[PDB]
Amino acid sequence: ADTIVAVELDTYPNTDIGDPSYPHIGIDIKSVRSKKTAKWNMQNGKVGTAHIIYNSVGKRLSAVVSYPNGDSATVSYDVDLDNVLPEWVRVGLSASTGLYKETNTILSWSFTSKLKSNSTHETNALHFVFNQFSKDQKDLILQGDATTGTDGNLELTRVSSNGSPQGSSVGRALFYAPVHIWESSAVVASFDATFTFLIKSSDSHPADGIAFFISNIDSSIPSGSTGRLLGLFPDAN
């Protein structure tokens, strides 16, 4: 299976697989069952922003999700990602729907990775920012139901012609270039990512969520990873 590290914005509590009994943000290390979660009030129809931060010195993966009214949730988990991730990864955004649904619209996404050595501040780095997506966004690998287009947004999951989200959808967008997430020579390796999103639903309950993830470079959507599995995992173990 793929190796996955992810920060989930999980809009649907699947308490039977260890989600807490509320919408939450979580840090997922090789399992959909988050190593750490925090309560998260998803604001239906509002534009959220998620920031994710790690470096190899503090070894603490942190995420904060906030909305324009000021409400924010934060989660941090102490982990040495050198022991989990492969040296080369792809980075991406993933989302799903199941029996319940929501728009999983990404309005912008930025990522920076840096490997800093012992010379000065000489550095390998990758930084990309999309504040608008294009129709034929050649620097993104879209998987599953994900599309970009003319409104300048990335729809991770399927949205019908009348605008409304669909159930049992899964899709992802990975930056096209592999990322050198660690390198043994480097003194510091850090990454950060930010994405803005608009989760809207008129369902009885929104589901399932959006994740920033880092995977093996050849990562593909696990079969059947709609719903609770966020397009990240083949199962809920």
Question: Using CA atoms, how far apart are residues 214 and 219, in angstroms rounded to an integer?
Answer: 9
For position 14 contacting Ca ion by CB under 5 A, the verdict is: yes
Residue 165: CB minimum distance to Ca ion, A: 16
Nearer to a copy of itself, 74 or 166 (CB): 74
Contact partner, 121, from Mn ion, a copy of itself, Ca ion, none, Cβ < 5-8 Å per class:
a copy of itself
| Integer CA distances (angstroms), 151 to 133, 134, 154, 160, in order | 8, 8, 9, 15
Binding a copy of itself (rule: CB under 8 A), the pick from 3, 41, 44, 72 is: 72
Binding Mn ion (rule: CB under 5 A), the pick from 2, 19, 102, 145 is: 19
Residue 21: CB minimum distance to Ca ion, A: 11
Q: Write phi, then psi, for 15 (nearest 5 degrees).
A: -65, -20
For position 180 contacting a copy of itself by CB under 8 A, the verdict is: yes
Residue 52: CB minimum distance to Ca ion, A: 18
Specify whether the CB–CB gap between 47 and 62 falls below 8 A.
Answer: no
**Residue 108: strand pairing partners:** 196
Question: Using CA atoms, how far apart are residues 63 and 53, in angstroms rounded to an integer?
Answer: 6
Nearer to Ca ion, 158 or 228 (CB): 228
Specify whether the CB–CB gap between 229 and 235 falls below 8 A.
Answer: yes
Nearer to Mn ion, 6 or 140 (CB): 6
The letter for the amino acid at 2 is: D
Specify whether the CB–CB gap between 104 and 98 falls below 8 A.
Answer: no
Binding segment toward Ca ion, per CB under 5 A, in 52-60, 61-69, 94-102, 226-234: 226-234
Nearer to Ca ion, 90 or 228 (CB): 228
Contact partner, 161, from Mn ion, Ca ion, a copy of itself, none, Cβ < 5-8 Å per class:
none
Question: Using CA atoms, how far apart are residues 99 and 168, in angstroms rounded to an integer?
Answer: 7
